[PDB]
Symmetry: C3
Protein backbone atom coordinates (compact mmCIF):
# COMPACT_ATOMS: atom_id res chain seq x y z
CA UNK A 1 0.00 0.00 0.00
CA UNK A 2 1.54 3.37 -1.17
CA UNK A 3 2.06 6.24 1.38
CA UNK A 4 1.63 10.02 0.70
CA UNK A 5 2.25 13.51 2.19
CA UNK A 6 0.72 16.88 1.08
CA UNK A 7 1.38 20.66 1.60
CA UNK A 8 -0.24 23.84 0.06
CA UNK A 9 0.37 27.67 -0.07
CA UNK A 10 -1.67 30.76 -1.14
CA UNK A 11 -5.46 30.71 -1.91
CA UNK A 12 -5.52 29.63 -5.66
CA UNK A 13 -4.10 27.32 -4.36
CA UNK A 14 -0.73 25.60 -5.08
CA UNK A 15 -0.63 21.90 -3.89
CA UNK A 16 2.29 19.38 -3.82
CA UNK A 17 1.66 15.60 -3.14
CA UNK A 18 4.61 13.17 -2.50
CA UNK A 19 4.09 9.35 -2.95
CA UNK A 20 6.41 6.51 -1.72
CA UNK A 21 5.80 3.46 -4.02
CA UNK A 22 8.12 0.34 -3.99
CA UNK A 23 11.06 2.36 -2.53
CA UNK A 24 10.81 5.54 -4.74
CA UNK A 25 9.17 8.99 -3.98
CA UNK A 26 7.72 11.15 -6.87
CA UNK A 27 5.94 14.59 -6.88
CA UNK A 28 2.59 15.75 -8.42
CA UNK A 29 1.83 19.55 -8.69
CA UNK A 30 -1.37 21.70 -8.94
CA UNK A 31 -1.26 25.52 -9.62
CA UNK A 32 -4.94 26.15 -10.63
CA UNK A 33 -5.26 24.26 -14.00
CA UNK A 34 -4.52 20.47 -14.11
CA UNK A 35 -2.08 18.11 -12.27
CA UNK A 36 1.51 17.68 -13.70
CA UNK A 37 4.77 15.90 -12.59
CA UNK A 38 7.38 17.78 -10.48
CA UNK A 39 11.22 17.62 -10.27
CA UNK A 40 11.36 15.64 -6.93
CA UNK A 41 12.46 11.98 -7.51
CA UNK A 42 14.49 10.27 -4.68
CA UNK A 43 14.56 6.90 -2.82
CA UNK A 44 12.28 6.23 0.23
CA UNK A 45 9.68 3.79 1.70
CA UNK A 46 8.15 6.64 3.88
CA UNK A 47 7.71 10.47 3.39
CA UNK A 48 6.54 13.65 5.22
CA UNK A 49 6.55 17.33 4.07
CA UNK A 50 6.22 20.95 5.33
CA UNK A 51 6.42 24.37 3.55
CA UNK A 52 6.59 28.13 4.48
CA UNK A 53 6.66 31.49 2.56
CA UNK A 54 9.26 34.32 3.02
CA UNK A 55 7.22 37.16 1.50
CA UNK A 56 5.97 35.40 -1.71
CA UNK A 57 8.96 32.93 -2.11
CA UNK A 58 8.16 29.21 -1.34
CA UNK A 59 10.48 26.88 0.69
CA UNK A 60 9.75 23.06 0.82
CA UNK A 61 11.38 20.38 3.08
CA UNK A 62 10.77 16.63 2.25
CA UNK A 63 11.76 14.03 4.94
CA UNK A 64 12.46 10.71 3.08
CA UNK A 65 13.12 7.50 5.14
CA UNK A 66 14.62 4.10 4.02
CA UNK A 67 14.85 1.66 6.99
CA UNK A 68 16.04 3.86 9.95
CA UNK A 69 17.90 6.47 7.73
CA UNK A 70 16.04 9.81 7.06
CA UNK A 71 17.36 12.33 4.42
CA UNK A 72 16.02 15.96 4.27
CA UNK A 73 15.57 17.45 0.73
CA UNK A 74 15.34 21.28 0.31
CA UNK A 75 13.54 23.39 -2.38
CA UNK A 76 14.50 27.13 -2.11
CA UNK A 77 13.68 28.39 -5.67
CA UNK A 78 16.34 26.52 -7.78
CA UNK A 79 16.13 22.66 -7.71
CA UNK A 80 16.44 20.18 -4.75
CA UNK A 81 19.58 19.80 -2.51
CA UNK A 82 20.27 17.74 0.68
CA UNK A 83 19.74 19.40 4.10
CA UNK A 84 21.61 19.07 7.44
CA UNK A 85 18.78 17.16 9.30
CA UNK A 86 19.94 14.13 11.40
CA UNK A 87 17.83 12.01 13.86
CA UNK B 1 -2.23 -0.62 13.03
CA UNK B 2 -4.01 2.80 12.53
CA UNK B 3 -2.57 5.78 10.53
CA UNK B 4 -3.62 9.46 11.08
CA UNK B 5 -3.33 12.94 9.44
CA UNK B 6 -4.19 16.38 10.99
CA UNK B 7 -4.81 20.01 9.82
CA UNK B 8 -5.80 23.26 11.71
CA UNK B 9 -6.88 26.88 10.95
CA UNK B 10 -7.47 30.22 12.81
CA UNK B 11 -6.54 30.94 16.49
CA UNK B 12 -9.36 29.16 18.50
CA UNK B 13 -8.37 26.84 16.90
CA UNK B 14 -10.34 24.51 14.56
CA UNK B 15 -8.77 20.99 14.16
CA UNK B 16 -9.62 18.01 11.86
CA UNK B 17 -8.02 14.53 12.49
CA UNK B 18 -8.41 11.71 9.84
CA UNK B 19 -7.86 8.04 10.93
CA UNK B 20 -7.41 4.96 8.64
CA UNK B 21 -8.66 1.97 10.76
CA UNK B 22 -10.10 -1.39 9.48
CA UNK B 23 -10.22 -0.24 5.78
CA UNK B 24 -12.10 3.09 6.45
CA UNK B 25 -10.90 6.73 6.99
CA UNK B 26 -13.14 8.62 9.55
CA UNK B 27 -12.99 12.30 10.75
CA UNK B 28 -13.01 13.90 14.27
CA UNK B 29 -13.57 17.70 14.65
CA UNK B 30 -12.75 20.43 17.27
CA UNK B 31 -13.97 24.11 17.13
CA UNK B 32 -13.30 25.23 20.77
CA UNK B 33 -15.62 23.01 22.94
CA UNK B 34 -15.49 19.14 22.64
CA UNK B 35 -14.59 16.58 19.89
CA UNK B 36 -17.44 15.36 17.57
CA UNK B 37 -17.60 13.06 14.44
CA UNK B 38 -17.39 14.73 10.97
CA UNK B 39 -19.08 13.87 7.60
CA UNK B 40 -15.91 12.38 5.94
CA UNK B 41 -16.12 8.53 5.69
CA UNK B 42 -14.40 6.84 2.66
CA UNK B 43 -12.23 3.73 1.93
CA UNK B 44 -8.45 3.84 2.73
CA UNK B 45 -5.44 2.12 4.44
CA UNK B 46 -3.26 5.37 4.33
CA UNK B 47 -4.19 9.16 4.57
CA UNK B 48 -2.59 12.66 4.15
CA UNK B 49 -4.32 16.12 4.37
CA UNK B 50 -3.78 19.88 3.65
CA UNK B 51 -6.14 22.95 3.98
CA UNK B 52 -6.30 26.74 3.19
CA UNK B 53 -8.63 29.59 4.43
CA UNK B 54 -10.75 31.79 2.06
CA UNK B 55 -11.76 34.47 4.63
CA UNK B 56 -13.49 32.42 7.41
CA UNK B 57 -14.32 29.54 4.93
CA UNK B 58 -12.05 26.40 5.11
CA UNK B 59 -11.10 24.29 2.02
CA UNK B 60 -9.78 20.70 2.71
CA UNK B 61 -8.10 18.10 0.41
CA UNK B 62 -7.77 14.48 1.75
CA UNK B 63 -5.54 11.92 -0.10
CA UNK B 64 -6.81 8.32 0.58
CA UNK B 65 -4.57 5.36 -0.53
CA UNK B 66 -5.42 1.60 -0.88
CA UNK B 67 -2.70 -0.44 -2.72
CA UNK B 68 -1.42 1.74 -5.65
CA UNK B 69 -4.78 3.68 -5.90
CA UNK B 70 -4.84 7.26 -4.39
CA UNK B 71 -8.24 9.13 -4.46
CA UNK B 72 -8.40 12.91 -3.61
CA UNK B 73 -11.55 14.09 -1.69
CA UNK B 74 -12.57 17.82 -1.66
CA UNK B 75 -14.46 19.94 0.97
CA UNK B 76 -15.37 23.51 -0.22
CA UNK B 77 -18.35 24.35 2.11
CA UNK B 78 -21.05 21.84 0.92
CA UNK B 79 -20.05 18.16 1.57
CA UNK B 80 -17.28 15.98 -0.02
CA UNK B 81 -16.69 15.23 -3.79
CA UNK B 82 -13.88 13.28 -5.63
CA UNK B 83 -11.00 15.39 -7.06
CA UNK B 84 -9.05 15.32 -10.38
CA UNK B 85 -5.78 14.09 -8.66
CA UNK B 86 -3.84 11.14 -10.25
CA UNK B 87 -0.29 9.80 -9.47
CA UNK B 88 2.79 9.75 -11.85
CA UNK C 1 11.43 1.03 9.27
CA UNK C 2 10.76 4.57 10.71
CA UNK C 3 7.73 6.89 10.06
CA UNK C 4 8.00 10.75 10.37
CA UNK C 5 5.74 13.85 10.52
CA UNK C 6 6.76 17.55 10.13
CA UNK C 7 5.42 21.10 10.90
CA UNK C 8 6.95 24.62 10.40
CA UNK C 9 6.14 28.31 11.25
CA UNK C 10 7.42 31.91 10.71
CA UNK C 11 10.54 33.16 8.81
CA UNK C 12 13.30 32.15 11.37
CA UNK C 13 12.47 29.62 10.02
CA UNK C 14 11.32 27.09 12.75
CA UNK C 15 10.84 23.32 11.96
CA UNK C 16 9.81 20.30 14.15
CA UNK C 17 10.26 16.64 12.90
CA UNK C 18 8.73 13.67 14.87
CA UNK C 19 10.08 10.07 14.29
CA UNK C 20 8.32 6.79 15.32
CA UNK C 21 10.95 3.98 15.79
CA UNK C 22 10.33 0.61 17.59
CA UNK C 23 7.23 2.05 19.39
CA UNK C 24 8.80 5.37 20.63
CA UNK C 25 8.42 8.95 19.15
CA UNK C 26 11.28 11.54 19.54
CA UNK C 27 11.49 15.22 18.35
CA UNK C 28 14.27 17.16 16.47
CA UNK C 29 14.22 21.03 16.38
CA UNK C 30 15.53 23.73 13.93
CA UNK C 31 15.51 27.52 14.79
CA UNK C 32 18.00 29.01 12.26
CA UNK C 33 21.39 27.54 13.40
CA UNK C 34 21.59 23.68 13.47
CA UNK C 35 19.29 20.84 14.70
CA UNK C 36 18.85 20.04 18.46
CA UNK C 37 16.74 17.44 20.41
CA UNK C 38 13.34 18.68 21.77
CA UNK C 39 11.32 17.79 24.93
CA UNK C 40 8.66 15.49 23.27
CA UNK C 41 9.34 11.75 24.02
CA UNK C 42 6.23 9.45 24.21
CA UNK C 43 5.07 5.99 22.94
CA UNK C 44 3.85 5.49 19.29
CA UNK C 45 4.20 3.37 16.08
CA UNK C 46 2.47 6.12 13.94
CA UNK C 47 2.65 9.97 14.23
CA UNK C 48 0.90 13.06 12.72
CA UNK C 49 1.24 16.76 13.71
CA UNK C 50 -0.38 20.20 13.18
CA UNK C 51 0.39 23.69 14.64
CA UNK C 52 -1.05 27.28 14.74
CA UNK C 53 0.22 30.71 15.99
CA UNK C 54 -1.40 32.98 18.64
CA UNK C 55 0.41 36.24 17.85
CA UNK C 56 4.00 34.92 17.31
CA UNK C 57 3.65 32.02 19.87
CA UNK C 58 3.44 28.40 18.53
CA UNK C 59 0.88 25.74 19.66
CA UNK C 60 1.51 22.06 18.59
CA UNK C 61 -0.78 18.96 18.64
CA UNK C 62 0.94 15.52 18.06
CA UNK C 63 -1.33 12.44 17.38
CA UNK C 64 0.60 9.34 18.64
CA UNK C 65 -0.87 5.89 17.66
CA UNK C 66 -0.01 2.52 19.33
CA UNK C 67 -2.15 -0.23 17.70
CA UNK C 68 -5.74 1.20 17.53
CA UNK C 69 -5.22 3.71 20.46
CA UNK C 70 -4.51 7.40 19.48
CA UNK C 71 -3.39 9.87 22.24
CA UNK C 72 -3.22 13.68 21.56
CA UNK C 73 -0.20 15.54 23.12
CA UNK C 74 -0.39 19.38 23.63
CA UNK C 75 2.36 22.09 23.65
CA UNK C 76 1.13 25.66 24.55
CA UNK C 77 4.41 27.37 25.71
CA UNK C 78 5.52 25.26 28.75
CA UNK C 79 5.85 21.42 28.38
CA UNK C 80 3.56 18.66 26.92
CA UNK C 81 0.21 17.53 28.51
CA UNK C 82 -2.31 14.87 27.25
CA UNK C 83 -5.34 16.26 25.29
CA UNK C 84 -9.11 15.45 25.24
CA UNK C 85 -8.99 13.82 21.71
CA UNK C 86 -10.74 10.42 21.19
CA UNK C 87 -11.47 8.53 17.88
CA UNK C 88 -14.90 7.65 16.29
C1 LIG D 1 7.65 24.45 -6.21
C2 LIG D 1 8.22 23.64 -7.37
O1 LIG D 1 7.25 23.50 -8.42
C3 LIG D 1 7.81 22.89 -9.58
O2 LIG D 1 8.91 23.67 -10.05
C4 LIG D 1 8.32 21.48 -9.26
O3 LIG D 1 8.95 20.94 -10.41
C5 LIG D 1 9.29 21.51 -8.09
O4 LIG D 1 9.65 20.17 -7.72
C6 LIG D 1 8.65 22.24 -6.92
O5 LIG D 1 7.50 21.51 -6.47
C1 LIG E 1 15.81 25.66 6.72
C2 LIG E 1 17.14 24.93 6.55
O1 LIG E 1 17.44 24.79 5.16
C3 LIG E 1 18.73 24.22 4.92
O2 LIG E 1 19.73 25.06 5.48
C4 LIG E 1 18.82 22.83 5.56
O3 LIG E 1 20.14 22.30 5.41
C5 LIG E 1 18.47 22.90 7.04
O4 LIG E 1 18.48 21.58 7.58
C6 LIG E 1 17.09 23.54 7.18
O5 LIG E 1 16.11 22.74 6.51
C1 LIG F 1 8.25 24.59 20.48
C2 LIG F 1 9.11 23.83 21.47
O1 LIG F 1 10.50 23.96 21.12
C3 LIG F 1 11.36 23.33 22.07
O2 LIG F 1 11.16 23.93 23.36
C4 LIG F 1 11.05 21.84 22.16
O3 LIG F 1 11.88 21.20 23.14
C5 LIG F 1 9.59 21.64 22.54
O4 LIG F 1 9.29 20.24 22.60
C6 LIG F 1 8.72 22.35 21.52
O5 LIG F 1 8.90 21.74 20.24
C1 LIG G 1 -6.97 22.94 21.33
C2 LIG G 1 -7.35 22.04 22.50
O1 LIG G 1 -6.29 22.04 23.47
C3 LIG G 1 -6.58 21.25 24.63
O2 LIG G 1 -7.72 21.80 25.29
C4 LIG G 1 -6.86 19.80 24.25
O3 LIG G 1 -7.26 19.04 25.39
C5 LIG G 1 -7.95 19.71 23.19
O4 LIG G 1 -8.08 18.35 22.75
C6 LIG G 1 -7.62 20.62 22.01
O5 LIG G 1 -6.46 20.14 21.31
C1 LIG H 1 -15.05 22.13 8.19
C2 LIG H 1 -16.24 21.18 8.22
O1 LIG H 1 -16.77 21.10 9.55
C3 LIG H 1 -17.96 20.31 9.58
O2 LIG H 1 -18.56 20.37 10.88
C4 LIG H 1 -17.60 18.87 9.21
O3 LIG H 1 -18.76 18.02 9.27
C5 LIG H 1 -17.01 18.84 7.80
O4 LIG H 1 -16.63 17.50 7.45
C6 LIG H 1 -15.83 19.79 7.75
O5 LIG H 1 -14.78 19.28 8.59
C1 LIG I 1 -8.01 22.68 -5.80
C2 LIG I 1 -8.63 21.73 -6.84
O1 LIG I 1 -9.99 21.44 -6.50
C3 LIG I 1 -10.67 20.71 -7.51
O2 LIG I 1 -12.06 20.66 -7.14
C4 LIG I 1 -10.03 19.32 -7.61
O3 LIG I 1 -10.67 18.47 -8.57
C5 LIG I 1 -8.55 19.50 -7.97
O4 LIG I 1 -7.90 18.23 -8.06
C6 LIG I 1 -7.86 20.42 -6.96
O5 LIG I 1 -7.79 19.81 -5.65
Amino acid sequence: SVQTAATSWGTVPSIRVYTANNGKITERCFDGKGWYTGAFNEPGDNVSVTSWLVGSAIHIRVYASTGTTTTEWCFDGNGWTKGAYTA
